[PDB]
Write a protein that binds this ligand. Sequence first.
Ligand SMILES: Cc1cc(-c2ccc3c(c2)CC[C@H]3N2CC3(CCN(C(=O)Cc4cn5cc(C)sc5n4)CC3)C2)ncn1
Ligand SMILES: Cc1cc(-c2ccc3c(c2)CC[C@H]3N2CC3(CCN(C(=O)Cc4cn5cc(C)sc5n4)CC3)C2)ncn1
Ligand SMILES: CCCCCCCC/C=C/CCCCCCCC(=O)OC[C@H](O)CO
Ligand SMILES: CCCCCCCC/C=C/CCCCCCCC(=O)OC[C@H](O)CO
Ligand SMILES: CCCCCCCC/C=C\CCCCCCCC(=O)OC[C@H](O)CO
Lengths: 389, 396
Amino acid sequence: LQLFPAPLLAGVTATCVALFVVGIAGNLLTMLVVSRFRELRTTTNLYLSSMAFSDLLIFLCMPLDLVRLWQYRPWNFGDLLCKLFQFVSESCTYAKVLTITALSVERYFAICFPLRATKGRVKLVIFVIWAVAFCSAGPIFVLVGVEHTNECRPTEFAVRSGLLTVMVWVSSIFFFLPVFCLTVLYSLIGRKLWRRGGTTMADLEDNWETLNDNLKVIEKADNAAQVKDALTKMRAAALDAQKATPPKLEDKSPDSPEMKDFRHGFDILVGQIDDALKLANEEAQAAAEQLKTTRNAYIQKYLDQNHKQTVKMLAVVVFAFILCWLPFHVGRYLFSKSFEPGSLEIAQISQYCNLVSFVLFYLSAAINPILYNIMSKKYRVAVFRLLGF
Amino acid sequence: LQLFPAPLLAGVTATCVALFVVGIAGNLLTMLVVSRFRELRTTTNLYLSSMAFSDLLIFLCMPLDLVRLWQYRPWNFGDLLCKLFQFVSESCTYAKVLTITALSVERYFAICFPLRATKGRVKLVIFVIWAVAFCSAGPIFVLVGVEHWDTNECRPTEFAVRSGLLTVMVWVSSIFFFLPVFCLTVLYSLIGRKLWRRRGTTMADLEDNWETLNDNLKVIEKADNAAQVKDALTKMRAAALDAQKATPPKLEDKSPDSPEMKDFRHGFDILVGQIDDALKLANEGKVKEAQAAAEQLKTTRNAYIQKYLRDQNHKQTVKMLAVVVFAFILCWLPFHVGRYLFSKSFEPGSLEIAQISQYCNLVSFVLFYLSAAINPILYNIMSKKYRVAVFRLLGF
Ligand SMILES: Cc1cc(-c2ccc3c(c2)CC[C@H]3N2CC3(CCN(C(=O)Cc4cn5cc(C)sc5n4)CC3)C2)ncn1
Ligand SMILES: Cc1cc(-c2ccc3c(c2)CC[C@H]3N2CC3(CCN(C(=O)Cc4cn5cc(C)sc5n4)CC3)C2)ncn1
Ligand SMILES: CCCCCCCC/C=C/CCCCCCCC(=O)OC[C@H](O)CO
Ligand SMILES: CCCCCCCC/C=C/CCCCCCCC(=O)OC[C@H](O)CO
Ligand SMILES: CCCCCCCC/C=C\CCCCCCCC(=O)OC[C@H](O)CO
């Protein structure tokens, strides 16, 4: 009994085809980047790659969604399709949710408890996630169907035995998990990142990242008569970088490495900067190269440094996930509260809500690589360098 | 090695997955539609269904083809995978050309030699087509391989190049390419020239009128209204006059004052009269009586006119086939032109050559899968009966 004009459906379908193409392309790019370069295979990235895979699966779901969208009369075998593919879609959703959770959890202990002490661990957790998600979505196979509107919805057997309400429990738990991750875990992350002794943990990262970028840019690019300003920035950043407290110290050491690390790093920065300043007024590039090796010889010795961009990008990611998934849940609750009353206009509202949930579903499947491209510079360079050497 | 951005290659890959979905769906639908709708089981439709098969077969190759495009060696039998699947692809391509040619030929004979002349025949012709294709693509199997700068495929081996077999296969490929060109250029242009040859109207016009008569006859089978049945009948009557003037194909080599044109031209005189009487029943609120009259129209039409004319849809058919064959040639053109230009070009191994060649191969790749997926689209755009049958099976 659908009330969507042909122009509206055509626009939805074209948008969805667009999302199909862009999302396949981008999630493929993400998975390839992770599998290609060794340094990018951090725990967080492996989880993201898992999610990229779930997104690809969702895109394979899309064609039958579009078919069902345009059908006036569903197929005889359609019931099975419904069951199977609803299961598929929701399995993926659950898996992605859990991956986010795992991810967030395993970043959380990575910052708030730096002191806590593996390969195959990540594979095991991914496998655990997929099995748990399959089991949690299992019931869908036996609770939704197509009965004598006329759509892939929960059957009456599901309604009149309570099983619908336990599946809504499961769905709501799964919805609140990423909300918990963004609101509670990411906020505790951000606390520890922006907590005071001379400066904060995030300011360490920015300063350290500012000093290296200036030196590395000039060492291999942007040749000019005077790069002393970059040398000045390096000195200032190195100066502030001493005021911070690296993670291995645990900020419980007033002077035992506070004297060791401050003296050693500041000394290497100091003397090299003074010699670089003299050559800058008048071999300067070689002095910068020599300064670099001491940094690697000391920075690697007592230090991830991407803790801030990682958390901020994960925040945007989890936010977009929850946004796209919110209208479904909200509409479901508000329309469950009024079932029989006013079944005329509320039906129109419900179909439009389901349509926006549809488009949002596939948008969520496509959006993460776009975010990565806009926010991660490392991601950009890795897609640039993907087919090289 | 790869001389274009990864985002381009990922986007091409996704586009190809889209063509995979659409092409599997469309060609499946073509085969189903022909197999179930019996008033769509023509000779040429059976040939098109054969083609739909070859296209499905092509789309199964696309997963491994994309793996090879990304230069992933997941296995060590790549060499074998190449000899096999390249063979597969060429065979399928050859099959289409031959089946195109086959149906073109038949359709040509049907129209230009109308005075001249079963379901086992088409089955045998398709069998023979597939045999000739498999043999003709056979040598691909033994002279392509994967063995030891700026290139990256499965490609002709040195044994192929330096024994002359590669040139023989380029000849074979070029002949196959030109067969559909011959079909479109020669056969279809002669067909259209006879189809639109004046004698009051043209043969193509008579087919439009016949087709409007048969369609409006189907309307009265289910019409419920005076104006509904009367509308159909009004359109028929204009059609019947304007078709009475035509010169039937079985009687093309006759005189305008023949005993056969009398019976033809008088047969429409009756058929107009029957329409007039069914109209006068419709005017007076006799809907079920006008439909009974309209059935006499069928039997009158059946006796006089079917004997004076087999297929009554040549014009629409050949327009569609021209679009199909043109699309085929266009998609296969860059491969052939590029191969020739790069053989003639004085310089191999240059980077600009390498980049040009890689881009040409990429667009040819996409074109190959586009040619495999586009036919059901064209049928849906052009044939209405086919589009309706597809929508019925899809539930639209
Ligand atoms: C021809 C036919 C097809 C089907 C059929 C029925 C259902 C579904 C599918 C096919 C594919 C996948 C599944 N389709 C996923 C889908 C539509 C969009 N969906 C929403 O809108 C709700 C939602 C979940 N979710 C998760 C996020 C993260 S964001 C977000 N929104 C989710 C369910 C339904 N049956 C009978 N015959
Ligand atoms: C993992 C692996 C895979 C393979 C392998 C090698 C080759 C091919 C395939 C797999 C699949 C099919 C075959 N692939 C078809 C193909 C690519 C696209 N091709 C073109 O672009 C040229 C063309 C023909 N043609 C006909 C038209 C009509 S339009 C048009 N274009 C045709 C050849 C090659 N080997 C080694 N390890
Ligand atoms: C919002 C950003 C837009 C960027 C990219 C937007 C377009 C992407 C794909 C277009 C091809 C899809 C083909 C059209 C898909 C729906 C077709 C349809 O439903 O019927 C229309 C038909 O053409 C009536 O004759
Ligand atoms: C060695 C290098 C040689 C390279 C040579 C490349 C030439 C390709 C040019 C083709 C344009 C010719 C236009 C032909 C248009 C025919 C369209 C057609 O017949 O189909 C339409 C259909 O019939 C509608 O009713
Ligand atoms: C070439 C034919 C292949 C068909 C399978 C393609 C695979 C993708 C499936 C669905 C895309 C969305 C369906 C596009 C909607 C087209 C239907 C349409 O626009 O026709 C209106 C009709 O009256 C309905 O009410």
